Each structure stands twice: as C-alpha cells, then as structure tokens.
Design a protein around this ligand. Structure first.
Ligand SMILES: O=C(O)C1=C[C@@H](OP(=O)(O)O)[C@@H](O)[C@H](O[C@@](CF)(OP(=O)(O)O)C(=O)O)C1
Length: 427
C-alpha cells in the first residue's frame, strides 16, 4: 500500500494497544491456573489470537465477549491432546513459551508456523527441555519448526545457564519447572523482560530471584486472576520516535507499560538529546504517559545489557539514529538476525533504499546520521516492525513515494496502527 509522505506536523493523544508479551502470558497463566481468569484491554493482534486458539485446541475454554477475555483454567496438568497440529502462525513467543507449557503433556503434538516462523531456531529451547525428559525435535540441527513434542509425567527439574539473552527461553523453562517435581534454577545471561516472573507471582505462584539466578520450586498450583494489560512500550516506541523526528510535533502516549526491563528506548532517546517528558506515573501498574517533541538528536552507542531492554526497538531506533547528527553504533545485537526477519539486514536494506548510511555488521549496525529520506518500495517480509518502521520513515520523505508490501503483517501486534497514524496527521 501507499504510505503517507511529507508529514508537516503530528499532534495528538494516542493510547497504544496492549503489551503483546503480557497478553500472551495472560492466556497461558489463565489456562494453567485453576478457576477463571479475566483479561482486560488485551492486545488482539494476530499473534495473541494464535495463542488463544492454541489453548482452545488444547481443550481450554477462552471466551472473548464485550471486550473481555474470560479463561476457564484447567489446572497445571489439565491440557488435553489437540485434534490437529497446533498453529503458531507468526508468533515466536507462542511456540517457544508453549513448548515449555507442554513439557508435562502426556501425549505428542505437532507445532507449525508460517514461512517466517519456520526459519527461526527452536534449538535454544529444545536443548534444555530435553534435559528435563521432554522429547522434542524439529528440522535440521537448529530444530526449525514444525516441531514435534511429547511431554512426560516424569518431568525432571531444570538447572540451566542460558547461553543467550532470551526472555522466551527463560519463560519456557519457568513454565516447565512449574510442572516438574523438585527445584529448578534458571540463570539468565543478561536481564531480560521479567513479565513471566511478575505474573507468576500475580497468579499465586512462587519463585526466588537472586540477581540473574531464578529458582522455581515445582510443581505448583496457580489461581485465576483479573489481568489488566498495560499499553505496549514496543508499540508506543513507533510514536516516540515519530514525535522526535517529524517537524512541529508533540505526541502524548498514555497508559504505556514502563517496566524497567522494557524501557531501553527511553535511555537512548535521553542519550541522544530527545525531548521526552514522563508523567502520570502509576508506580504499581508500572505505566505512565510519555510525551515527545520535535528534537535535534546526536548519535549514541547501544551495547551489552541495554540490548535485551530494547531488542525489538532497534528497527525504529535505527530510523531514529538516521536523523541524529553523527554516528550511532549498535552492537551485541546478533539476536536481531534471528527475529521475524534478520532485523539487521532487512532494516539496513529498507532504510538505505530510503536515505542510507547504515552499515550492517555481524552484531548490529553503524548508522551515520542526518539523512534526508526519499521514496522507495519496502517489503515487510512478514515482520510487523519492519512495516511500522517504514511507515514512520515515510513521514519524513519530502518528495517521492513509498510503497510498503505485505503491510498486513502489522496486524500481528498493532491492528489499529494506521488508524492512530491518521488521527495524529489531522490537528
Ligand atoms: O518473551 C517475549 O514475549 C519476547 C522476548 C523477545 O524474544 P527473545 O526471548 O528471543 O529475546 C522479543 O524479541 C519478542 O518480540 C518479538 C520477536 F520477533 O516477538 P516474536 O518472537 O513472538 O515474533 C517481536 O514482536 O518483535 C517477544
């Protein structure tokens, strides 16, 4: 589709949709717990719907009525063999976390995904899951989907040192540990989003966190909860940058989750000199309203430790970097290559075809700032973030046109994205 170009001003209040990571987990915890769980303001992007259907296929009743998700929990050993193979679509979070969820399933199930998902490695989760007694295998040594998994009633606790900064692997193992008999210790390589840890407690579960060492005692019984989903910072991120980058702009993003393990983009905007105001802070829900203004940026360095706090924001941060004076380096981000697309190569190609000066590297990219952007055709390749990044980049194209193919990929995490864009463009 044709993207809006040469924007003159962006003014408005935006309430971004629910956090995808938390939305996914709300369905998992709701299904594994006893009693009912209700989720409010859940993200209805396609990936979360995939998670919901997966559990329905596993025998879980999940009702979406009057904007509220109601889940009738089945226990912790209540999932049942599905009639057909489980469709994980484009959701990496779904297949990886659910692989751990099924660690105790006394049956074999198949798990497939779309073209994109089938190119992502699952070995990072099968290796440790097989240590617990789970039987799992995929295509090639990397264990690419489709996967075949058979759990066991005799799950052994896990003792694992994660070789990569992955929140998904940590979470899968935590869900598994919850079913195993004994004490499991999962050691993070670097701190990653801790939504699983937070929600396990919210659902009556227990764990001990000593720095990067996470200890989970199993097996546990969880209790249904009322879950209220906060706005997704990863979605708010597209507007945070749009507001700093577009001329004569001031955007107010309300109800944005502000969990410290997810706020990496705030630190970067800071270091780059962007005008960012944080207000209406809810110290408990961990949310706030972020206000951004047209700013003149300076390049910065993004590396180790900060990476997991903003892996998903590197695509738009690259665009952000594109508008800053000087060079900005991104490293220790080899994990990008393994996302819905190789976010190093696709991001570099996409933006270079538009304004340029992005040098892809083995562990990130180097961007030389302040490029006037121009028209181009960009393909999403099934990655919602590539699409939304191009959409904001297009706003800065003074002359020319931008065609974005496979734009529907954006509905994977932000269906009303273009609606919100339109609302800011007027007034
Ligand atoms: O646990 C989670 O919910 C996530 C943590 C990160 O993945 P990882 O554990 O591999 O670093 C994130 O990169 C991941 O975000 C992505 C990655 F492509 O989600 P998917 O893996 O589900 O596609 C995204 O939406 O960009 C969501």
């Amino acid at each position: 589709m044709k993207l809006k170009t040469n924007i003159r001003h962006l003014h408005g209040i935006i309430r971004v949709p629910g956090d995808k990571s938390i939305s996914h987990r709300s369905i998992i915890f709701g299904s594994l717990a006893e009693g009912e769980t209700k989720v409010y303001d859940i993200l209805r992007g396609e990936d979360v719907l995939s998670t919901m259907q997966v559990f329905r296929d596993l025998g879980v009743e999940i009702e979406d009525k009057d904007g509220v998700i109601t889940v009738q929990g089945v226990g912790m050993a209540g999932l049942k063999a599905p009639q057909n193979a489980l469709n994980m679509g484009n959701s990496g979070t779904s297949i990886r976390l659910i692989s751990g969820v099924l660690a105790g399933a006394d049956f074999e199930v198949e798990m497939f995904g779309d073209d994109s998902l089938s190119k992502r490695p699952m070995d990072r989760v099968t290796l440790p899951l097989k240590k617990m007694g789970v039987s799992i295998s995929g295509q090639t040594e990397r264990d690419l989907p489709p996967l075949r998994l058979k759990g066991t009633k005799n799950l052994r606790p896990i003792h694992y040192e994660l070789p990569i900064a992955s929140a998904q692997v940590k979470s899968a193992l935590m869900f598994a540990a919850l079913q195993a008999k004994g004490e499991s210790v999962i050691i993070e390589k670097e701190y990653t989003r801790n939504h699983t840890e937070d929600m396990l407690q919210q659902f009556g579960g227990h764990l001990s966190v000593d720095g990067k060492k996470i200890t989970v005692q199993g097996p546990q019984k969880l209790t249904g909860q009322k879950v209220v989903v906060p706005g997704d910072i990863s979605s708010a991120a597209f507007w945070l940058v749009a507001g700093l980058i577009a001329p004569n702009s001031r955007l107010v993003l309300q109800n944005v989750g502000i969990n410290e393990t997810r706020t990496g983009i705030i630190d970067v905007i800071r270091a780059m000199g962007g005008k960012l105001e944080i207000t209406e802070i809810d110290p408990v829900a961990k949310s706030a309203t972020l206000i951004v203004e047209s700013s003149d940026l300076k390049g910065t360095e993004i590396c180790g430790a900060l990476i997991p706090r903003l892996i998903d924001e590197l695509p738009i941060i690259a665009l952000l970097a594109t508008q800053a004076q000087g060079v900005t380096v991104i490293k220790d981000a080899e994990e990008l290559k393994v996302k819905e697309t190789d976010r190093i190569q696709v991001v570099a190609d996409a933006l270079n075809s538009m304004g340029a000066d992005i040098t892809p590297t083995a562990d990130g990219m180097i961007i030389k700032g302040k490029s006037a952007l121009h028209g181009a055709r960009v393909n999403t390749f099934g990655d919602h973030r590539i699409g939304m990044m191009t959409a904001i980049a297009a706003l800065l194209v003074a002359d020319g046109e931008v065609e974005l193919d496979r734009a529907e990929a954006i509905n994977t995490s932000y269906p009303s994205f273009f609606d919100d864009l339109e609302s800011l463009i007027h007034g």
